[PDB]
């Protein structure tokens, strides 16, 4: 079955700024990936985004009750649903599991990659820093970036390229909204000599 | 800059007659409606503790999406969708340790239309038991993403692959994991 396909999408979007102080509602209609018509609460009426949507913007904007409903959506829909979901979405905070390990078993005084694996956290905003004997390392730091697991958790792996020497202590530090106190995990080069 | 975004995302696809109705918060699924069973399906059980959604309302919306699709298909002179093949990544949920239960994640990203076949393979054989998957998740570029999951017990003996088939690909796409 390789028959041609035809896709309609609709996205009713609520964008929230400073809690619910400012809200923007978008009613967005798509043919394949192409948005063709949109209501934006900052505009207050439908507008064609492409020529495919011209017939709809005119037709819907001529219905007064229809527009009044869309214009109230910032409250009836957006702020309403924010309130419903707040405790388990906006206020969801899941503390990270942090593991530090060398990427390969290597003798000291040779190149290695030290891995700081930060797993299972929420929300996505995070800072992960590497230190060598208390001095922050900025160069030779490579990461996976932020990875969504699909289950309302994230992970990231943050790697430090280094040549570890006897007696050195490397530290991975995590800053994240779930923390009530600092999160650091050490790797001692003398523990893997 | 915005703090949060909630999206009610829907689609209807011809000639498959397939549809979807879901809510997204900052890129994660809150729920979708199983329109065969007319049931609200929460992404995490805990979300249904306090919140509710009238699943029948989704069917009404999908009927409008169908009617709209018919109109837009005519307006476009039957311009069909261009297939965009997925980018696939296999991940583990946590750092892997021998004989410590873990989960393989197959992340299927940046594709359309929202029709895909995903099969977990253990030593080349399809795994049917213990697997789970998400519905199609919307992207800001109006493509889709999806996750498939396989709980597993890590061993030196087993190898795994996520096999993905999509109209945009020239062959099945295999992404490998082994210890």
């Amino acid at each position: 079955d390789t028959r041609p396909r035809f896709l309609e999408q609709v996205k009713h979007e609520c964008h929230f700024f400073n809690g619910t102080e400012r809200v923007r509602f978008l009613d967005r209609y798509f043919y394949h990936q192409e948005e063709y018509v949109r209501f934006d609460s900052d505009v207050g009426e439908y507008r064609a985004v492409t020529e495919l949507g011209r017939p709809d913007a005119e037709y819907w904007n001529s219905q007064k009750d229809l527009l009044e409903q869309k214009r109230a959506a910032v409250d009836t829909y957006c702020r309403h649903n924010y309130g419903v979901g707040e405790s388990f979405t906006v206020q969801r905070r899941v503390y990270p599991e942090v593991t530090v390990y060398p990427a390969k078993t290597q003798p000291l005084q040779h190149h290695n990659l030290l891995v700081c694996s930060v797993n299972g956290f929420y929300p996505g905003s995070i800072e992960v820093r590497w230190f060598r004997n208390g001095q922050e390392e900025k160069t030779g730091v490579v990461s996976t970036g932020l990875i969504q697991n699909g289950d309302w958790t994230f992970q990231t792996l943050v790697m430090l390229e280094t040549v570890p020497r006897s007696g050195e202590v490397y530290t991975c530090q995590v800053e994240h909204p779930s923390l009530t106190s600092p999160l650091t995990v050490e790797w001692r080069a003398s523990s893997a000599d | 800059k915005e703090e949060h975004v909630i999206i009610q995302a829907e689609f209807y696809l011809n000639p498959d007659q397939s549809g979807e109705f879901m809510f997204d918060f900052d890129g994660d699924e809150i729920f979708h409606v199983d329109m065969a069973k007319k049931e609200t399906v929460w992404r995490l059980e805990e979300f249904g503790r306090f919140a509710s959604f009238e699943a029948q309302g989704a069917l009404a919306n999908i009927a409008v999406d169908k009617a709209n699709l018919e109109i837009m298909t005519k307006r476009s002179n039957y311009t069909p969708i261009t297939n965009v093949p997925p980018e696939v990544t296999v991940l583990t949920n946590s750092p892997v340790e021998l004989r410590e239960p873990n989960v393989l994640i197959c992340f299927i990203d940046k594709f359309t239309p929202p029709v895909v076949n995903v099969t977990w393979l253990r030593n080349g054989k399809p795994v049917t038991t213990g697997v789970s998957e998400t519905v199609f998740l919307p992207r800001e570029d109006h493509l889709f993403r999806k996750f498939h999951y396989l709980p597993f017990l890590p061993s030196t003996e087993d190898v795994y692959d996520c096999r993905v088939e999509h109209w945009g690909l020239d062959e099945p796409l295999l992404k490998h994991w082994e210890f």
């Binding site: 609709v10 009713h12 009613d27 209609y29 017939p55 709809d56 037709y59 819907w60 229809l66 409903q69 959506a73 009836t76 829909y77 309403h80 649903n81 309130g83 419903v84 979901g85 | 009610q8 829907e10 809510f23 306090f50 919140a51 509710s52 959604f53 009238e54 309302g57 989704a58 919306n61 409008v64 999406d65 009617a67 709209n68 109109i71 837009m72």
Partner: peptide, 14 residues
């Protein structure tokens, strides 16, 4: 509490 559904508008058959 109940999550509110946004309605879809119906395109002009034109």
């Amino acid at each position: 509490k109940r999550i509110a559904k946004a309605v879809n508008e119906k395109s002009c058959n034109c």
